[PDB]
Amino acid sequence: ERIEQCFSRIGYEVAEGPEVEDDYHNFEALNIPGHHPARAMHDTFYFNANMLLRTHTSPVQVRTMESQQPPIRIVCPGRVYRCDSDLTHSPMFHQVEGLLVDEGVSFADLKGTIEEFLRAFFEKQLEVRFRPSFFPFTEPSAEVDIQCVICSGNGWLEVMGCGMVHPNVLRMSNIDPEKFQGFAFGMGAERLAMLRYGVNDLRLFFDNDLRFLGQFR
């Protein structure tokens, strides 16, 4: 609710989609080729060869890009699924992804958006660091770090990823990369909640113990 509010107050629309998705919306449309390890059964939950459980909320952004022409300003919260299960990782979790597609969007616009979001979210004028990373769906891409001001026990912490939407991603969804530029970002809701509330064990989120839940009234 809090992540959505930071963007919805500035023109972003809340977009939702199905949790049972197809290879196209979940992978192909996001510049993830068929031979990419993300598509394997070691990471992705499958029903058949083409139908799966979405590994991210980006398919929702894809469905938006197909349905309409720019400007697009959307935030996509939702349940996402991954095979990797144990401590530090759950087979089901939540993430919030964002997308802005307009005529003159820059990496400067993205840095500003992300920096002000984290500041608004954590209610502090904290330091925000951008490290060059990689994602098939963005170029340039960045991993975003914040200071340890919200601790590791309640000098940098990785909290989210972002980048400029890849030309092939726009082109595939019938958006001219020559006329339109865009940025997109993603974050894990549980990771953020743990940072905010001083939660140590991620497994506490899915047990629904009243002795846990009651602490958030």
Ligand X SMILES: CNC(=O)COc1cccc(Nc2cc(Cl)ccn2)c1
| 135 lies in the site for ligand X, by CB under 6 A | yes
Is the C-alpha dihedral spanning 132, 53, 83, 41 positive or negative? negative
Q: What is the CA radius of gyration of the chain?
A: 17
Residue at token pair 């984290």: 118
Among the residue ranges 6-14, 32-40, 94-102, 195-203, the one whose residues contact ligand X (CB under 6 A):
94-102
- Beta carbons within 10 angstroms of residue 134's beta carbon: 12
Distance CA 89, CA 112 (A): 30
Q: 85 or 215: whose CB is closer to ligand X? A: 85
- 47, two tokens: 């029903």
Q: 146 or 187: whose CB is closer to ligand X? A: 187
CB 34 within 8 A of CB 75: no
Given 7, 117, 121, 137, the residue binding ligand X (CB under 6 A): 137
CB of 172 to other proteins, least distance (A): 15
Question: Is 16 annotated among the ligand-binding residues?
Answer: no
Residue list 140-169, contact with ligand X (CB under 6 A): 160-163, 165, 169
Residue list 40-59, contact with ligand X (CB under 6 A): 58
Output the known binding site for Mg(2+).
139
